[PDB]
Ligand binder design. Structure first.
Ligand SMILES: *[C@@H]1O[C@H](CO)[C@@H](O[C@@H]2O[C@H](CO)[C@@H](O[C@@H]3O[C@H](CO[C@@H]4O[C@H](CO)[C@@H](O)[C@H](O)[C@@H]4O)[C@@H](O)[C@H](O[C@@H]4O[C@H](CO)[C@@H](O)[C@H](O)[C@@H]4O)[C@@H]3O)[C@H](O)[C@H]2NC(C)=O)[C@H](O)[C@H]1NC(C)=O
Ligand SMILES: *[C@@H]1O[C@H](CO)[C@@H](O[C@@H]2O[C@H](CO)[C@@H](O[C@@H]3O[C@H](CO)[C@@H](O[C@@H]4O[C@H](CO)[C@@H](O)[C@H](O)[C@@H]4O)[C@H](O)[C@@H]3O)[C@H](O)[C@H]2NC(C)=O)[C@H](O)[C@H]1NC(C)=O
Ligand SMILES: *[C@@H]1O[C@H](CO)[C@@H](O[C@@H]2O[C@H](CO)[C@@H](O)[C@H](O)[C@H]2NC(C)=O)[C@H](O)[C@H]1NC(C)=O
Ligand SMILES: *[C@@H]1O[C@H](CO)[C@@H](O)[C@H](O)[C@H]1NC(C)=O
Ligand SMILES: *[C@@H]1O[C@H](CO)[C@@H](O)[C@H](O)[C@H]1NC(C)=O
Ligand SMILES: *[C@@H]1O[C@H](CO)[C@@H](O)[C@H](O)[C@H]1NC(C)=O
Lengths: 214, 234, 213, 104, 106
């Protein structure tokens, strides 16, 4: 569904008593995909007092309106961990088993925004008959798309290969940039990746050189 | 009116409860514990189970009783006419026997809508037998976190005060005549939505549907009764 | 902290009895509850207060709780009992849900029943011939059908249809139809359907000779 | 274009004679638009009946098949009728699926 | 005009190790036939399910593709399994070819 911006707030609503006997207790349970059920809190229409779980003591607020006969929980400062399905259950008054689990509401958030991490790739220090060494730099853990990679102020573009970004399991992106160059030009020229990511104003340069070997 | 039948009050209960004490009686409303998990038999061992060493030799005794918890059917509840609303936490259920709710009322009888917050609010409940009007007796939960009870007077090297039943220990004393609280028999309760919150040591009782005749009227009721250790039908 | 533990997964065959355990510290002093959840559906109560079952649940379900373990028992397990099961308890003014246990039932392999119906004379009069092959009551899904016309393999010019799975038996059905022009149909003699699929030692061929009867 | 269905029998095997339950059916072909409804004798047979999803023909047309399994010994005296209903054409068509003569 | 791929393998950085994450990378340079396959075998033992692949498109005045394979290793996993190897299967090659390196950065 529509993705809520990080740091915002959401509301989950349920039917409630209109100002008379209820004979039920309401509760809220969140389920992350394939991670089981977690309780947040409960509410009693007869006694306006709520009951919050410990883990979410600081972000949940339960309040009900009797004219609309509707009780909702407000959750503030959502983070990447709070993407899940919310279930609203109504159980008997004093037996402590929840029945009639209502339709679930899905809520999704989009990670955060931060710059990339740049790393080099050591070229082969072993002599090659052909005379071709493949230097590379790897840009990973950035969000959102895209990033721009160049070599030596954009004056080197013969053989450059910028592979398309790939989605990581965590939720961020990875990308690589590789240049194949003559072997006899590894200790006489300076090779630098220039990575520019505007969404976070990140301009990072990194030299790439064969590692020290005796 | 002062009373309300049909199992629907509106909001006019007394919303005055306490939070300083750490007992968490209010927090104990979502769930109830098992019979042996809450140390009931310590609190249930203070009253005599079946036949209370008596034979007999109709009159009413005022006497008194004001101290011990009303958790088993032995009691001598006193007469209550009016109670300040600053002490009540939750509905005040009074038994016709059929459960009935009384809400906060002003001194002169004017209903008040303040959730029991205002100081002057009181509850008028002049405990009286239905044959003469009103209800046998009734029950609520005091703000500090303990159950209370009240009702009519018990009737007529050992002793026996009968607030209810005592069929074989009296010339056919019945609930319509001597019943004071929600105790229809030594092991039966007048079930109502908040019964498990005022008497949390009757959780194991089974459900039952019953018909009763009081005076010249009939009441259809649902009661709670455990497995009596002699017999089902009499 | 209070935490409840359950086995991660349990596998049983149809008609057998399955047991799921929810464990804890002195759990026997609590009123446990059981929820059943199908993929993408809101969980439903299946047992409350140990052994008290609500209305609408078949008598197969049963439960018990003692010592440090609560056992949910299912008898006569069938394909509609594969799901996640969760154990609920109360402690220290806080709710605790046990780790979900996924119950899955191992299905058995069923050999297909295969038939070949030749074309009808009435259709043949219209210039188009259809030869149909039927594979019904088989499992698993992956089965392959190969047509043969006088030791000639057929590629294309064939339509394949498969129905939805049956809940009770967990079996599929498969119709493979070959369409030919009249002249082409009468330009050959022997027709054959060939089936290769699990549960068969060797591929099975159902053939006939047109123009005989 | 509202082109009605054409129905053809799927007769049972010549003999296939054993406790080997036989099968018989009806093939609906060259109609548009979908769908049709297929019914057996008086629409009062539900055991061992299959109606496959409609397949798209080469020339934007459709085809569908209905097949029912039947005990062999019943073919001697009992009879089966396929009924196809197509709403766009408002056409109901009935055919008798008899066993082949198998004589010459 | 089938062209055999050129295979390279790059060790992890001297920087990521401080972040508690290792990332081995194996590169297949220009090769026309699209079909290909890489197989990570570390300490003569194969893995699957923890590697990802990226592919570009042939240049304008050319017809060859390029492919990269990234294998992610959790913290402390790179500390063992002395030997590492990338294996590639393809046409043109006489036999599948493996490029290997020792974790000692010899
Ligand atoms: C505590 O005190 C009382 C305890 O007695 C509590 O409960 C009483 O319960 C009443 C019944 O629900 C409540 O007033 C009701 O408000 C409803 C709201 O519904 C809408 O009303 C507005 C009117 O502008 C419109 O949107 C629609 O008409 C909706 O119906 C009413 O429906 C309900 O009865 C209505 O009366 C008028 C007709 O004269 C219309 O609103 C409608 O046709 C319907 O028949 C009634 O008005 C209220 O909670 C309370 N009673 C009153 C009189 O306030 C309260 O919750 C607590 N507070 C107060 C101040 O009582
Ligand atoms: C209703 O809420 C009220 C307050 O809002 C609570 O009421 C009772 O408060 C008293 C405190 O005094 C206490 O019960 C009685 O206390 C008596 C002394 O005040 C005790 O009687 C005698 O006291 C002697 C000196 O202390 C001592 O020798 C001995 O203790 C002797 O018994 C006696 O202990 C009474 O219990 C309770 O805190 C409370 N009464 C109870 C719990 O029965 C209370 O929460 C509610 N009312 C109830 C429950 O009746
Ligand atoms: C209902 O409640 C009480 C029951 O007696 C009566 O109120 C009494 O009012 C007198 C007047 O000063 C007080 O002194 C008493 O303390 C009160 N009695 C109590 C609290 O028990 C009230 O009149 C009763 N209603 C009647 C008699 O109709
Ligand atoms: C109920 O407890 C509170 C503390 O939670 C304390 O102030 C007092 O004992 C009671 N309430 C008030 C308002 O005094
Ligand atoms: C409740 O049941 C038994 C039998 O009355 C009692 O002795 C004990 O306190 C509780 N539980 C167990 C398991 O004994
Ligand atoms: C509260 O009761 C007092 C005494 O009757 C008086 O102030 C008024 O009636 C009420 N005031 C409010 C604000 O409820």
């Amino acid at each position: 569904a529509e993705v809520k911006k990080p740091g915002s707030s959401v509301k989950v609503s349920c039917e409630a008593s209109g100002g008379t006997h209820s004979n039920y207790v309401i509760t809220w349970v969140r389920q992350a995909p394939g991670q089981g059920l977690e309780w947040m809190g409960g509410f009693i229409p007869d006694f306006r007092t709520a009951m919050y779980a410990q883990g979410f003591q600081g972000r949940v607020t339960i309040t009900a309106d009797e004219s609309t006969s509707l009780a909702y929980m407000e959750l503030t400062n959502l983070r990447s961990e709070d993407t899940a399905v919310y279930y609203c259950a109504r159980g008997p008054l004093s037996r402590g088993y929840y029945d009639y689990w209502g339709p679930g509401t899905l809520v999704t958030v989009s990670a955060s925004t931060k710059g990339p991490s740049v790393f080099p790739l050591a070229p082969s220090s072993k002599s090659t008959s052909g005379g071709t060494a493949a230097l590379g730099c790897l840009v990973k853990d950035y969000f959102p798309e895209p990033v721009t990679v160049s070599w030596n102020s954009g004056a080197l573009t013969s053989g450059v290969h910028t592979f398309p970004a790939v989605l990581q399991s965590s939720g961020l992106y990875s990308l690589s940039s590789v240049v194949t160059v003559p072997s006899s030009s590894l200790g006489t020229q300076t090779y630098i990746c220039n990575v520019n990511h505007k969404p976070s104003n990140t301009k990072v340069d990194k030299r790439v050189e064969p590692k020290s070997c005796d | 009116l002062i009373n309300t039948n049909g199992s629907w009050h509106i909001n006019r209960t007394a919303l005055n409860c306490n939070d300083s004490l750490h007992t968490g009686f209010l927090a104990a409303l979502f769930y109830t514990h098992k019979f042996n998990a809450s140390g009931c038999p310590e609190r249930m061992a203070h009253c005599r189970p079946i036949d209370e060493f008596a034979q007999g030799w109709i009159t009413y005794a005022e006497g008194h009783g004001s101290d011990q918890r009303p958790y088993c059917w032995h009691y001598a509840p006193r007469q209550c006419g009016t109670i300040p609303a600053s002490q009540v936490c939750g509905p005040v259920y009074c038994f016709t026997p059929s459960p009935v709710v009384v809400g906060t009322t002003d001194r002169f009888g004017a209903p008040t809508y303040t959730w029991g917050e205002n100081e002057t609010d009181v509850l008028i409940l002049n405990n009286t037998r239905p044959p003469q009007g009103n209800w046998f007796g009734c029950t609520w939960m005091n703000s500090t976190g303990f159950t209370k009870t009240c009702g009519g007077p018990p009737c007529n090297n050992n002793t026996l005060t009968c607030p209810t039943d005592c069929f074989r220990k009296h010339p056919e004393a019945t609930y319509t005549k001597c019943g004071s609280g929600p105790w229809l028999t030594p092991r039966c309760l007048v079930d109502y939505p908040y019964r498990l919150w005022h008497y949390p040591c009757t959780v194991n009782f089974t459900i039952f549907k019953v018909r009763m005749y009081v005076g010249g009227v009939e009441h259809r009721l649902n009661a709670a009764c455990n497995i009596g250790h002699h017999h089902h039908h009499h | 902290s209070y935490v409840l533990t359950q086995p991660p997964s349990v596998s049983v065959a149809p008609g057998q009895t399955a047991s799921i355990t929810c464990s804890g510290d002195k759990l026997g002093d609590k009123y446990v509850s059981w929820y059943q959840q199908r993929p993408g559906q809101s969980p439903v109560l299946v047992l409350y207060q140990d052994s008290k079952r609500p209305s609408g649940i078949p008598e197969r379900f049963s439960g018990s709780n003692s010592g440090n373990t609560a056992t949910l028992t299912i008898s006569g397990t069938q394909a509609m009992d594969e799901a996640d099961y969760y154990c609920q308890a109360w402690d220290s003014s806080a709710l605790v849900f046990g780790g979900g246990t996924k119950l899955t039932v191992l299905r058995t392999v069923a050999a297909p029943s295969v038939f070949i119906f030749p074309p009808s004379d009435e259709q043949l009069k219209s210039g188009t011939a259809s030869v149909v092959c039927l594979l019904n009551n088989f499992y698993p899904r992956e089965a392959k059908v190969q047509w043969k016309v006088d030791n000639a393999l057929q590629s294309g010019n064939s339509q394949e249809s498969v129905t939805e799975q049956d809940s009770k038996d967990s079996t599929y059905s498969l119709s493979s139809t070959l369409t030919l022009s009249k002249a082409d149909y009468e330009k050959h003699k022997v027709y054959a359907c060939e089936v290769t699929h699990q549960g068969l030692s060797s591929p099975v061929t159902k053939s006939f000779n047109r123009g005989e009867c």
